[PDB]
Every structure is written in structure tokens, then in C-alpha cells.
Amino acid sequence: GFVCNTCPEKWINFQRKCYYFGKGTKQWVHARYACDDMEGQLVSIHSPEEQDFLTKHASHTGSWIGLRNLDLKGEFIWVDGSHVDYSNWAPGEPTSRSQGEDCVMMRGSGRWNDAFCDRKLGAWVCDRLATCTPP
């Protein structure tokens, strides 16, 4: 169970995860289901090296990621339930005064903006666990 770097076709490995860079115009919840129906989830990001890997492959015109303010009251959490131990917010984000802007996108710089969930974006990123080579 020693080496975890195998992904399915069309996915890209980085560390112990596989990532799928989707293209196609979708609102946040729609991208959420595209990822689930391929057996991953909208991406969660947990380190600067993971962020750097995403920034190099990310779409220039913005991508949905798996961060959402779930519950009115300003606390953004990952769809996969993993915890928030890393953040790459654009300066000033997320703001208190933006009622309704509960979903998160990653810009071409890789920095994160909150967004209305019904915004349509051209790209979205899924992740899943890499499987491991038997030695």
C-alpha cells in the first residue's frame, strides 16, 4: 500500500490526489454534481503546494472550487467535509456585506473570490484520492 499516485484516465496526479480540470459552463451546484457523477468532489485545497499545482493548470477565466458558506452565518467549509487549514483568499475576501455570495471560485491568479452560486463559469475542478501501487 506504499505508493499512492495512480489516477484514472484524464485525471492528473499531485501528491496523494487526482484532479480533473473541467471545461463547460456551469453554476456552482451543477459543477458540484458533475464532480460527484465522476466519483470525485469539487476540489478542496489544503496547502500552498497544492494551490501552486492548481494555479498552473487552472483556467484563466476562473473555476469553481469546493468551498461554500454553508449556513447564512459567514463560515466557509469544504464540500468534502475536510477542514479549512489553508486559505488563498483574494485580499478583502470573503466580505461580511455580501449576502448571497456563498460559493467560491478560483481566479486565473489562483486566488479565491466568493460569488453568487448562480454565476456561470467556464471551468471547475474535481479531486479524488489517488489509489496505490501494490509492491
127 labeled part of a ligand binding site? no
Q: Answer whether residue 68 is part of any domain.
A: yes
Distances, alpha carbon 64 to alpha carbons 4, 17, 29, 135, in Å = 26, 18, 10, 37
39 labeled part of a ligand binding site? no
The number of CA neighbours under 13 Å toward the Cβ of 32 is: 15
CATH number at residue 54: 3.10.100.10
69 labeled part of a ligand binding site? no
80 labeled part of a ligand binding site? no
**What total of structural domains would you count in the chain?**
1
Q: Answer whether residue 113 is part of any domain.
A: yes
How far is residue 45's CA from residue 20's CA, in Å, rounded to a whole number? 14
Q: Answer whether residue 89 is part of any domain.
A: yes
Q: Answer whether residue 53 is part of any domain.
A: yes
Resolution in Å, one decimal place = 2.2
Sign of torsion, CA 76 66 127 122?
negative
> What residue numbers bound the domain in which 72 lies?
11-130
Long-range contacts of residues 106-113, Cβ cutoff 8 Å, at least 24 apart? 106/54, 106/58, 106/62, 106/63, 106/64, 106/65, 107/62, 108/58, 108/59, 108/60, 108/61, 108/62, 109/55, 110/51, 110/52, 110/54, 110/55, 110/58, 112/65, 112/67, 112/87, 112/88
